[PDB]
Amino acid sequence: MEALIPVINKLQDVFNTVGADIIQLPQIVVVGTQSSGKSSVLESLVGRDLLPRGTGIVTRRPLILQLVHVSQEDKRKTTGEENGVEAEEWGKFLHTKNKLYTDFDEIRQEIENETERISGNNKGVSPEPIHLKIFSPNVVNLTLVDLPGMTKVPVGDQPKDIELQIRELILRFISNPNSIILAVTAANTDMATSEALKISREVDPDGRRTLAVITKLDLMDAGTDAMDVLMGRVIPVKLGIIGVVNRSQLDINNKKSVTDSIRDEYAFLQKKYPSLANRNGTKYLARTLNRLLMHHIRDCLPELKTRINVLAAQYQSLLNSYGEPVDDKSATLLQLITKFATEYCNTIEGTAKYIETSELCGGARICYIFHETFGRTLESVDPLGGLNTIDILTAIRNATGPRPALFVPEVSFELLVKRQIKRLEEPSLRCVELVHEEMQRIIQHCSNYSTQELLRFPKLHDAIVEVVTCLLRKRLPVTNEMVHNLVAIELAYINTKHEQRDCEVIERLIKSYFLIVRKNIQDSVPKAVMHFLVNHVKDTLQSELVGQLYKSSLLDDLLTESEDMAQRRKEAADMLKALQGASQIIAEIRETHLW
Amino acid sequence: MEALIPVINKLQDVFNTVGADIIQLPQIVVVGTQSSGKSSVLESLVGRDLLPRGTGIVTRRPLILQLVHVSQEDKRKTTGEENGVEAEEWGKFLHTKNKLYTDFDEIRQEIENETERISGNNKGVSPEPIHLKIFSPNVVNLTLVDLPGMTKVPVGDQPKDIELQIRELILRFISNPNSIILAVTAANTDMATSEALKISREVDPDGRRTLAVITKLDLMDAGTDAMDVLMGRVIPVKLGIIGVVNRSQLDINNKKSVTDSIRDEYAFLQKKYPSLANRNGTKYLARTLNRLLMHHIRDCLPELKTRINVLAAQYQSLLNSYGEPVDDKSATLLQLITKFATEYCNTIEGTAKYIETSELCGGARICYIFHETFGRTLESVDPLGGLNTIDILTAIRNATGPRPALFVPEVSFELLVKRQIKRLEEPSLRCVELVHEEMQRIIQHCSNYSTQELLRFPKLHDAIVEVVTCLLRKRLPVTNEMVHNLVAIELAYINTKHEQRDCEVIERLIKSYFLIVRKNIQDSVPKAVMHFLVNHVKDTLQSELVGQLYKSSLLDDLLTESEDMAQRRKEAADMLKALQGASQIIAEIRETHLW
């Protein structure tokens, strides 16, 4: 069936209403470049002009366009949702509350107003997306995500290094293996020089998810026809290439007729391209995009279902936590503190059901630092320190003095090995902070995934984070001093009593004693850190939380709920209902589609 | 060889000064009983009256009678050893110089006066022997040890424990395996009743080294007969029994000619002893004693030669130490401090040439403590002993919570292994104390063998010993704290990162971790102890010595000297000369006796 796309659209609008996350469900992301009239193509598909276009960047903020296939039957069921104004091809904004704008001039004016208000004179990066639900009968069910396009020469007033930021934003958006890359390039510049195809190949060298679009098919008269480009024989695309005659900004701003432009484009394609005319059309292009999106949804159905189940479980836990009455504050807060301490201890030991060997965090990261980081850093130093025998001879001569060399002075050895042992001090401290910082990464990590009950009340989460940070800061100097004392004992007092022959003996003693000291440090420092820092704090975390979260009335402050938090709770309950409905709908589909 | 006899006597006048007999040597020790006529027999043997008369107790201090036959050959062994003596017949004391006693009565009076002065009014026994050498043409070369006689009158100013003191003094001499016990036995009663026989059976029931001389024969003329005791039918001996008549004190005090007494004794022996008349006598007793001594010297030739050479070398080294006293206070003190520091460092290295006669070469012993003693002590403390079913059950139930336990919680295992490891603190302190005692023994070795010149100045010796001991004792607590910290660190770390069933699992894990911790502590703690104690002392010995000993107002007090030290040095020089002479005399024998 084709209800999967409407279900995804419902999920997306719910996510936007509840602060949509970066992890988005399968959607078509459009990437353009210089002289790319993406907005013109979207208007041609819609059949009316409703967005501002421009060479390269059309809107300097992310734009979410939901083309809803609202047939004549559903016109009265969708126009009546808000206000009383109704039409056949109409757009709704959720960033701007209600106020349906049937007239496209109002939509353009609102877009310009918001762009000026937010982006300002210099157009930077705005992670907040812009949502616009378009309803029309001609348009098929589709979800388009428009972002600034990669351009060698930035258009308008923007940072000269904005190209890297745009590329990183596109990579972040298409990181999930569910986005359909709609590549739009100007016929004036070869696709090889275009950056959109470069990024598409970087994320996917094969054209398994990239649809190349050739625009500006009006200037080919002054040059060469794009027939070869559409065929795509230099860099074949496994999905195909569709080209249309893009409309200039001047004509669009003059309130032109979209039907005339579509007719001219169709005639041009039919004449210049005897074969690339059946599928190179607005309706055909929209249907091809919808089919590609459906294919991607079919491919990602297992991962999509896994993500949906994870989100449903998270929201169920959030609802269960939020519904607990504040009655009996002491017992509930004590239970929450005990649960948080148990989760933290399990994460330290790795027994918590949120971290595995695949993911580096908590105990796993500490073990990696102790074994690989610290061990490899210590091993990086050569046993002799890389000093040539000439240096050893010079040191021996300097220490012994101007007398014949017949007895080996051990002090010379002490002068050299120490220098190497001192170099072992720096990595240890570097590791200690890496461990300390790692503890900090735990504090939020659980709250990010495990202890959402902390996120329920921001005050409680902040207080717990501050208490844990203070405990870590108090324990850091003690562990650091103990490690430094161990290093000092192993460094200052080494001794051997605990010309060529003298140099050889000194070098051998240096190597042997340095290896022994390195082994001792490797065996001791991690164990000392576990003693003073990890093991000591494991059980003490619960006691510290209990003693710091309750003096006489601190419980009320911790469990404070904000109005924004209440709104988020309501939106999350709505999201939970939507997730339950989506899971019920998906359960109808057989497992044949989950492969 | 005659020269072999006097030299041994010189040894008896040197080692006995420092205490007991350092080396067993062929010698004659006279042991008497109550109412013993030893004085008369000795006077008859000497040919003149030179000892106190009377029976029972006649001398209160160890008196040595060293008769030397006059001969030009022996002169080299007499004048060279002493400051110089030459006369016809005379007695000389090694404790006195520049005075020759040509009259034996004067010798006896001087001996009595010295004994009274040293021992005071008391008749007890003092720890100070007497040296006496008698030269005459009618005395065979023989050395005897005339110990204080037995007294049966404990009452009076003399100590009530005189018998015990006399027994201990006699034992100190006869305990040597090379000594020959001349037992003076009273013929009035059975030989066993005599104290000499009683003491003889304590360690030498065979009597292989016991030569019996029967006294108190004057009163045996009427009544009981002494023939039974003379024949040895009471306590037979393997060497023979000699009968000498006890001369009356009154007759001797009246200036009785010794020749007349000898004639009377010979007549009495002929009349009363037909079996043994010319075969028994004081001269025959002296000849038998000399024969036994010479035969024992012949038997001990190899070992005696080796020991004499070793002692000669050692005393030459001591004289070299005693050779040149301090000439410049500051320079001599600095040289002594530097030499002491070097010797201490060498001893710590376990390679110093100077070594004791009872232990290892100082620092080497310390290594042994770290190898076998400490390891065996640690292994003696088995992991089992502190675990029982009741305590294990209680710990498991407490760790699990308010519900029964059917698993193996890690907290209980960690607590139990920590408690077991805490038991390892005591062996560490034992090893540290052993190392400290070894260092004290090294200090004593340096004081007594390597720094005899330091001994000459007792103040400096005491100051150095006290300073070193105080430094070691002050470094001791720091090492103890470091080892305790190491033990505490080694027990908290968890190495697993890289009801009967539960109890058995807990016990096995505890045993494994305890063994691992024992290995780790045995590998580590010795290094820390050497760093804090061995290396630190090696580095700071000179600094501490300079800081504590070097002063501008202690040179005179530290370097005090006394004439007694000069006398002891002269005695040591005489000892060295006598040892060299004995070595030269003994080096004239063939080599077949060595194998």
UniProtKB/Swiss-Prot annotation, chains A, B:
Ubiquitously expressed with highest levels found in skeletal muscles, heart, kidney and brain. Isoform 1 is brain-specific. Isoform 2 and isoform 3 are predominantly expressed in testis and skeletal muscles respectively. Isoform 4 is weakly expressed in brain, heart and kidney. Isoform 5 is dominantly expressed in liver, heart and kidney. Isoform 6 is expressed in neurons. Keywords: Acetylation, Biological rhythms, Coated pit, Cytoplasm, Cytoplasmic vesicle, Disease variant, Endocytosis, Glycoprotein, Golgi apparatus, GTP-binding, Hydrolase, Isopeptide bond, Lipid-binding, Membrane, Mitochondrion, Mitochondrion outer membrane, Necrosis, Nucleotide-binding, Peroxisome, Phosphoprotein, S-nitrosylation, Synapse, Ubl conjugation. GTPase activity is increased by binding to phospholipid membranes. Residues 344-489 are annotated as: Middle domain. The modification N-acetylmethionine is found at residue 1. It holds the Pfam family Dynamin_N. Phosphorylation/dephosphorylation events on two sites near the GED domain regulate mitochondrial fission. Dephosphorylated on this site by PPP3CA which promotes mitochondrial fission. Dephosphorylated by PGAM5. Changing residue 527 to E: Abolishes homodimerization and formation of higher order oligomers. Changing residue 39 to N: Reduces peroxisomal abundance. Disulfide bonds: none annotated. Its EC number is 3.6.5.5. Residues 32-39 are annotated as: G1 motif. One of its GO terms (biological process) is mitochondrial membrane fission. GO terms for molecular function: GTP binding; GTP-dependent protein binding; GTPase activator activity; GTPase activity; identical protein binding; lipid binding; microtubule binding; protein homodimerization activity. Changing residue 34 to A: Abolishes GTP hydrolysis. Changing residue 446 to A: No effect on S-nitrosylation. It is linked to May be associated with Alzheimer disease through amyloid-beta-induced increased S-nitrosylation of DNM1L, which triggers, directly or indirectly, excessive mitochondrial fission, synaptic loss and neuronal damage. Encephalopathy due to defective mitochondrial and peroxisomal fission 1: A rare autosomal dominant systemic disorder resulting in lack of neurologic development and death in infancy. After birth, infants present in the first week of life with poor feeding and neurologic impairment, including hypotonia, little spontaneous movement, no tendon reflexes, no response to light stimulation, and poor visual fixation. Homotetramer; dimerizes through the N-terminal GTP-middle region of one molecule binding to the GED domain of another DNM1L molecule. Oligomerizes in a GTP-dependent manner to form membrane-associated tubules with a spiral pattern. Interacts with GSK3B and MARCHF5. Interacts (via the GTPase and B domains) with UBE2I; the interaction promotes sumoylation of DNM1L, mainly in its B domain. Interacts with PPP3CA; the interaction dephosphorylates DNM1L and regulates its transition to mitochondria. Functions in mitochondrial and peroxisomal division. Mediates membrane fission through oligomerization into membrane-associated tubular structures that wrap around the scission site to constrict and sever the mitochondrial membrane through a GTP hydrolysis-dependent mechanism. The specific recruitment at scission sites is mediated by membrane receptors like MFF, MIEF1 and MIEF2 for mitochondrial membranes. This is Dynamin-1-like protein. It comes from Homo sapiens (Human). The lineage of its organism: Eukaryota, Metazoa, Chordata, Craniata, Vertebrata.
